[PDB]
Design a protein around this ligand. Structure first.
Ligand code: FAD
Ligand code: FAD
Ligand code: CL
Ligand code: CL
Ligand code: CL
Ligand code: CL
Lengths: 462, 462
């Protein structure tokens, strides 16, 4: 009947979060209404940043060999992401349900208590905790935790119940998709017909009219409908209730962004909520999940709507495609768009300074220490802070030592770095558990103890 | 009853063309149905390239002091054109009718025979000439010329009569504009209301609903309606019949492009048609007006429709504005868009080579010769070819001399040039009468006699 945190939903947000919470030592119970995984695999593949956030927790061997691609697009306009370092890491084909499967197995292995066939019906936040009414296999009962995170999808029960505001615009049309056998081991169709208002046969009629080709004879594996409703909560947290994934942001599924943003909500949240449970941090840390991820979510609605207009509008939008195509020929444009599609652009407010990596993801950096060959990616496996002492400076090691219960201080000779990476001439980096750079030397206005304090809390009492 | 060329229309296309034809020594008769200039001034200002094509004919003193601005925009998104060299030359406020007035006076001074209150009713092209039925002050009569150029506006009588194909898309909505006194020497309004189907009072109703402010009490100077019909002729010439201006391309009036493109159609055409009349060139030269200017016209429909979508669509297009705004922060994007709005981007196919100016406009270049201080702009005043011998190379002077009846060969020490201008390390430039670079050394694949031949025709018989 207890846990430190209750997570509602075992989609990719919920499973990632459960795992992250376990890495922070948190007792976590996940509540999922479905008895089994649906096996749909509506999304295909994942972004280079998602691949990186899997990698930094050692999750990748679970997938085996993964096909990658630099061939991306923005609203249908094709171009090469190769122009942006690290964009090569995008997984091309993995179905959503395989990804979910691995994250479930990962999080379960770490000790997450996942209760399937348990539906959350209602909830009460009373300042000291959250209590949920749940229907399980045994019928109605209650559970209680310090915190409750709604990872329960587009039509979130938690969002509805805790009184979150969810402004934005209602659905305007309807698309269709189908898993089908016959003509071209089943191939997918993408049915986006002109002017469909908000049986599988109608899905055929929508294909014969759009392309001229007849397919009313195909075996229907999966058939589904979806909108272009675009909404985001004004608050990611109301007291002891938190949201991550679709529960916080819905949009047209354009340019492969939803699962990726939701998994990455969970990666921002886990370590922060864990610090809070463990008592090493205050709710100030917790607020940075709202500000950081509301900002990201806002950008996701922009991204997907902008692509949707380019994809779904008639020939009237062609002059815009044409202009944008011309712009895409410029390196800076290509990279900007690749930055946005990949998620590699993501930059949190961590204070000012000239260091080009502040607030951005720490890119993969090879490291030789005194006792081992390792990498920044490797050192992130346990979801602790990582301070890289790149120029054998022992003063640095002593300034940070009061946070060494929470931050690994690593002295290493760094590998070769690219001009564009941001790592040239860098003598030190403080990396947050989610991989984001809190501070670097030289070129941070804020000092190292401020950064350590801001993300990890009070120093140890000597 | 005769002339070498008959021009139909004394809008800015017709007046510029008349002038250009006079500079080539051509007997030109302009036929204009209106008795006086309407005085509307629907367009305000003109582009930096228009300013340059006026400048290169010494037309500018007619305007006196002209206010210029680097503050431009693309579909409402404001930014600084200063990033592109020469974009500063955009005239900010001059009304269309002042500009027309000066071009009329300029062309009349050069000997253009302009017949006002003469309307073209019909025409016949019979392989050796064109004959028009015209109603004048004396009633119906006929005129004949070697060529006929329709510069007769959006609803072109010439285009209709000579059987030009005019594909594209019909008008979709309707806007309004008004010259008005009262609140804020009369100020203009811009009325673009949501969902108006294809009296001045309705123009007031369209202002009170759009802004919330009431103005049903204002004195109506000028009041007009216009569409977003977007069409372009597939042929700029059918035999001995030619089109320039709106007669060839109609579009939404977005981002100040129409008059500018039409004046510039006339600048491309005049010298070519003149060479043809004078017998120094063949109809091959004349075809390059079609190819060069159809291409430009096609780009104009793209430009204006793309801006219109950004201007006139609801909030649904805001994510696109936002993305585009972000892109505009990049120099290359800013310049590209400035290139397109200013017209400075315009580049004709003149053959290949590495020289960065091939086919582009020759930028203003100061020149010291043996007998005078001058400029490339100055040398273009008489609409002849100009070959700049920038490194005292007498072999060059002799290779071109067989075209010196048609091409001024000028030996000069060039002034300081910018890195981005395209003139660094350039030893020679062949400039066409419209200001476009046909050939330059080093870095042209084609040789100088080929270029001379292609634009000026047969060499002189020694
Ligand atoms: C056609 C289509 C294509 C897509 N393609 C892509 C793509 O290419 N790339 C991409 O990144 N994203 C894509 N998405 C979005 C993606 O599918 C993600 O699942 C979604 O964006 C985020 O998942 P989530 O974990 O937050 O929520 P969900 O995946 O919706 O999971 C929420 C879970 O909560 C459970 N639940 C709900 N209510 C309760 C309750 N009261 N009690 C207990 N449990 C509950 C549900 O059963 C569900 O399993 C696509 C979506 C669609 C429709
Ligand atoms: C509201 C508005 C704002 C605009 N703003 C701008 C702007 O900011 N910048 C810009 O560059 N452009 C702008 N334009 C376009 C611009 O007004 C130009 O005049 C047009 O783009 C090109 O002019 P033209 O000489 O080809 O034809 P026109 O100006 O239409 O002149 C054609 C002439 O032919 C005459 N004619 C027609 N039929 C016959 C016949 N049978 N016989 C004899 N004569 C005939 C007509 O009387 C007319 O004078 C705007 C247009 C509108 C409506
Ligand atoms: Cl998506
Ligand atoms: Cl090792
Ligand atoms: Cl225009
Ligand atoms: Cl002089």
């Amino acid at each position: 009947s207890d846990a430190a945190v209750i997570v509602v939903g075992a989609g990719p947000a919920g499973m990632m979060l459960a795992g992250e919470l376990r890495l922070a030592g948190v007792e976590v119970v996940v509540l999922e209404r479905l008895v089994e995984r649906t096996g749909e695999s509506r999304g295909l593949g994942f972004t280079a940043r998602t691949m990186e956030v899997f990698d930094q927790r050692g999750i990748l061997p679970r997938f085996g060999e993964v096909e990658t691609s630099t061939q991306g697009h923005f609203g249908g306009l094709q171009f090469d992401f190769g122009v942006l370092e690290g964009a090569w890491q995008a997984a091309k084909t993995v179905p959503q349900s395989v990804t979910e499967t691995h994250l479930e197995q990962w999080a379960t292995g770490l000790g997450a208590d996942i209760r399937r066939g348990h539906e959350v019906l209602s909830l009460t936040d009373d300042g000291a905790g959250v209590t949920v009414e749940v229907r399980g296999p045994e019928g109605k009962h209650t559970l209680r935790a310090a915190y409750l995170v709604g990872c329960d999808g587009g039509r979130s029960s938690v969002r509805k119940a805790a009184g979150f505001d969810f402004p934005g615009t209602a659905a305007t049309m309807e698309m269709y998709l189908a898993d089908i056998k016959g003509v071209e081991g089943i191939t997918r169709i993408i049915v986006c017909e002109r002017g469909t208002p908000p049986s599988w046969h109608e899905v055929a009629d929508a294909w014969k009219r759009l392309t001229g080709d007849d397919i009313a004879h195909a075996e229907p594996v999966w058939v589904s409908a979806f909108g272009n409703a675009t909404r985001q909560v004004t608050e990611y947290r109301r007291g002891r209730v938190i949201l991550a994934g679709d529960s916080a942001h819905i949009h047209l599924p354009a340019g492969g962004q939803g699962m990726n943003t939701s998994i990455q909500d969970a990666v921002n949240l886990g370590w922060k909520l864990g610090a809070v449970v463990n008592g090493t941090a205050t709710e100030e840390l917790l607020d940075s999940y709202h500000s950081e991820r509301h900002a990201v979510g806002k950008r996701l609605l922009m991204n997907t709507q902008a692509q949707g207009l380019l994809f779904l509008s008639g020939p009237e939008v062609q002059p815009l495609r044409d202009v944008l195509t011309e712009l895409i020929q410029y390196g800076e444009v290509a990279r900007h768009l690749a930055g946005m599609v990949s998620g590699l652009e993501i930059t949190y407010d961590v204070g000012t300074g000239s260091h080009p990596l502040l607030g951005k993801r720490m890119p993969a950096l090879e490291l030789t220490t005194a006792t081992r060959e390792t990498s920044s990616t490797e050192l992130l496996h346990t979801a602790r802070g990582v301070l890289l002492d790149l120029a054998d400076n022992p003063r640095l090691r002593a300034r940070a030592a009061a946070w060494s219960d929470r931050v690994d201080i690593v002295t290493a000779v760094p590998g070769e770095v690219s001009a564009t990476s941001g790592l040239r001439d860098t003598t030190a980096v403080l990396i947050r558990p989610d991989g984001h750079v809190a501070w670097a030397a030289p070129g941070s206005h804020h000092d190292l103890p401020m950064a350590l304090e801001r993300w990890f809390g009070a120093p140890l009492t000597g």
